[PDB]
């Protein structure tokens, strides 16, 4: 199981058009409580959110830490029956941890330890964004700006549709 589930809820990513974004949650926000449920880990957050929805709560208070103050925001409780979520995720830096042999990324010489800065002239801060851009590639070549030991390198590669994942794949795994 991923180790963030037992870690504190420090926001690394805010999904676009998500409840989280609408009410102004930012990366760096530390979620500490929701309604009457203490949130010490990502797992607590997940469980509280599901509990509230199933008990029929529509709106509740979300308690954040931001620059050492508590912020109180009213949020719509996501509808778990529709699979709806809050729209936050922990930080995963776009750093390559693994490269599948034979893959498009392997072929163009991407190596573990590379930092992906930019996809198709669009700066990215997280692995989710890389994934998003690959999903949206339409199987057409994508350009990546990479940082390797402080040096800027340009790469261009074509995503393959992968039957296991049901979507485009370039062959990169993030560092944990």
């Amino acid at each position, epitope marked *: *199981v*991923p180790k963030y589930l037992k870690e504190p809820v420090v926001v690394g990513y805010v999904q676009r058009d998500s409840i989280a974004q609408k009410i102004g949650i930012k990366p760096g926000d530390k979620i500490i409580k929701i309604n009457g449920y203490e949130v010490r880990t990502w797992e607590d957050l997940r469980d509280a959110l599901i509990r509230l929805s199933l008990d029929g709560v529509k709106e509740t208070t979300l308690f954040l830490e931001r620059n050492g103050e508590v912020l109180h925001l009213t949020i719509k409780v996501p509808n778990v029956q529709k699979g709806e979520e809050l729209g936050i995720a922990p930080l995963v830096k776009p750093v390559v*941890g*693994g490269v599948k042999k034979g893959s498009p990324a392997d072929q163009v010489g991407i190596k573990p330890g590379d930092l992906i800065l930019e996809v198709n002239g669009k700066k990215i801060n997280t692995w989710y964004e890389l994934v998003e851009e690959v999903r949206k590639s339409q199987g057409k070549a994508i350009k990546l700006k990479i940082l390797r030991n402080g040096k800027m390198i340009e790469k261009e590669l074509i995503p393959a549709k992968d039957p*296991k*994942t*049901g979507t485009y794949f370039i062959g990169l795994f993030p560092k944990t």
Partner: antibody, heavy 123, light 112 residues
Framework: EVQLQQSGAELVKPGASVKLSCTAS????????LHWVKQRPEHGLEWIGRIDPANGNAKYDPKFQDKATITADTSSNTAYLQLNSLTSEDTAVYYCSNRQLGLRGYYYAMDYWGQGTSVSVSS | YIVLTQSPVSLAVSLGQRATISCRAS??????????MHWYQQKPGQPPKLLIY???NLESGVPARFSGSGSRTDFTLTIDPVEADDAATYYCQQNNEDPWTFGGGTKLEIKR
């Protein structure tokens, strides 16, 4: 919102063929695969096959390779399942489906099913 | 092809208590540090619904009382506590290798 909408129930006679359809909303089939699953009355689930709508490449379970034919139309966002040379073992509910998954480091699941299409093979 | 043998075939669990369903694969289903094995719930007259994917990950909205564990050839779905809504047939499914296969199903009865 994502939907897979399947055509209505079919009564067909043995020996013949039928064509079932699945129409997708809220996503482009061209970016993924559509799958077909068979479920006979009182039985479990059996994977028939998938198609890549971008290149018409369809893959089957060898057992269905010749009794099922899967096609897709990207302009109308629709996948089809053709069953030929129908026997009574072909009588079942047929499901179209899509799944997409994020891996270690970025886990997510997109999983959608049509409501199923009942096919009765009878004289 | 990968045979998936699911056990038990049927069971009756009291509201509040633990359900355990196992899936055995004829060959491994791991690749690059993930197991390509998933669990579905199928209610009567409804399409399957994903619960757990890649052995251990909860689908959006699925309660934590559902968990999946295992790797390689040996996998378990745990339902603890079981609730009224869990009355259904459960299936493991693998897609590490073509063709995709389902287990035979496990029918869960709820004791009330």
């Amino acid at each position: 919102e994502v939907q897979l909408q399947q055509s209505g129930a079919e009564l067909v006679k043995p020996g013949a063929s039928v064509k079932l359809s699945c129409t997708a909303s809220g996503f482009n089939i061209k970016d993924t695969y559509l799958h077909w699953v068979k479920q006979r009355p009182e039985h479990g689930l059996e994977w028939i096959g998938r198609i890549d709508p971008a290149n018409g490449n369809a893959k089957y379970d060898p057992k269905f390779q010749d009794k099922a034919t899967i096609t897709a139309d990207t302009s109308s966002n629709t996948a089809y399942l053709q069953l030929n040379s129908l026997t009574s073992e072909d009588t079942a509910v047929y499901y179209c489906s899509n799944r997409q998954l994020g891996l270690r480091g970025y886990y997510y699941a997109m999983d959608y099913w049509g409501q199923g299409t009942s096919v009765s093979v009878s004289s | 092809y990968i045979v998936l043998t699911q056990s038990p075939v049927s069971l009756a669990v009291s509201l509040g208590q633990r359900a355990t369903i196992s899936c055995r694969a004829s060959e491994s289903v791991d690749s690059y540090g993930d197991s390509f094995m998933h669990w579905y719930q199928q209610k009567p007259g409804q399409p399957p619904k994903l619960l757990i994917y890649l052995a251990s990950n909860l689908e959006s909205g699925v309660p934590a009382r559902f968990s999946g564990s295992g790797s390689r050839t040996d996998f378990t779905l745990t339902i603890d506590p079981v609730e009224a809504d869990d009355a259904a047939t459960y299936y493991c499914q693998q897609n590490n290798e073509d063709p995709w296969t389902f287990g035979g199903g496990t029918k869960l009865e709820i004791k009330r």
